[PDB]
């Protein structure tokens, strides 16, 4: 159910993270549980860099990449506050009236060039 | 260099060759190939072409 | 110079190549008479000091024409 959970709802231990050689950038984020099966499948499915750079479904690594992509979307949205920022950009007056996030709304200036 | 001399479309090696080679190469394959192949294929189906379905395939989980 | 267009009203360059033809050019915003260029009230110095006989005559003719027209309008007030 949760975005950070993988297909099998299995949490990976520190020894498993070390053995599977998870990059530190992924390790800092919360998507290790969904990244590890994707890397395991890619190790089991060695493809050229062109295949990764061109295939949109990632070929054989379809379900694992779907879970990892959902987790990545949520992770990079929360690290960015991009949902709140886009909500305030779409309608700055309505967002302030509704009080989506007063902390962000109290210091938000859209800019003159962007429809004032 | 290789200053080729070749009467195109009026020569035996050219358009007449293109018109002549397929009609003669495909003589035996078309006069003894088709009849022999048809006989060999249809001699089996004296009663039918049906595939006796072993391994079921009529069963579903 | 034009697609699906006929140029019947267009003036021919053959016509333009002849000197002395009777074509008149009517252009937008064409002020062809300086009837109002040199009329100014509350002059700091003499109109003769700042303007010559040509400009003064232009202004005087414009004022005379306007005054005569207004006096003509006075007959139905």
């Amino acid at each position: 159910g949760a975005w950070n959970e993988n297909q099998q709802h299995y949490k990976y231990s520190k020894e498993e993270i070390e053995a599977y050689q998870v990059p530190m950038r992924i390790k800092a984020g919360p998507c290790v549980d969904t990244y590890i099966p994707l890397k395991k499948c890619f190790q089991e499915n060695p493809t050229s860099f062109a295949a990764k750079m061109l295939d949109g479904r990632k070929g054989k690594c379809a379900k694992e990449f779907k879970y990892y992509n959902t987790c990545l979307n949520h992770w990079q949205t929360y690290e960015n506050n991009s949902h709140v920022t886009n909500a305030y950009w779409a309608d700055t007056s309505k967002a302030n009236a509704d009080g989506i996030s007063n902390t962000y709304g109290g210091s938000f200036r859209k800019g003159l060039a962007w429809l004032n | 260099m290789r200053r080729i001399f070749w009467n195109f479309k009026t020569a035996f090696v050219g358009l007449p060759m293109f018109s002549l080679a397929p009609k003669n190469i495909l003589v035996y394959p078309i006069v003894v190939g088709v009849p022999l192949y048809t006989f060999i294929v249809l001699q089996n189906s004296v009663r039918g072409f049906a595939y006796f379905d072993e391994y079921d395939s009529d069963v579903k989980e | 110079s034009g697609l699906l267009r006929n140029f019947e009203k267009l003036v021919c360059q053959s016509q333009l190549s002849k000197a002395g033809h009777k074509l008149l050019l009517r252009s937008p915003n064409s002020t062809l008479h300086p009837t109002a260029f040199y009329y100014k009230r509350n002059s700091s110095q003499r109109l003769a000091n700042e303007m010559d006989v040509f400009q003064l005559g232009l202004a005087a003719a414009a004022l005379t024409r306007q005054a005569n027209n207004y006096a003509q309008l006075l007959d139905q007030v």
Partner: protein
Amino acid sequence: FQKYPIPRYLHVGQWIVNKNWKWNTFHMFFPTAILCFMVWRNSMISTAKPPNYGEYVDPQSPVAPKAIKY
């Protein structure tokens, strides 16, 4: 640049071409390769690599890093 004469006594490398350079290349490449092979073996005796994919270090194994017992 236009070629100019070089003194015969001077051991300089200006416009020097050896007509037998192929055998010299052979006998300067192959023994160098052998020497580097020997040095490579010697240095490969002392070489460290991290564990491969799917391999973890047991913390209680002798391979694991150790701390001084005072």
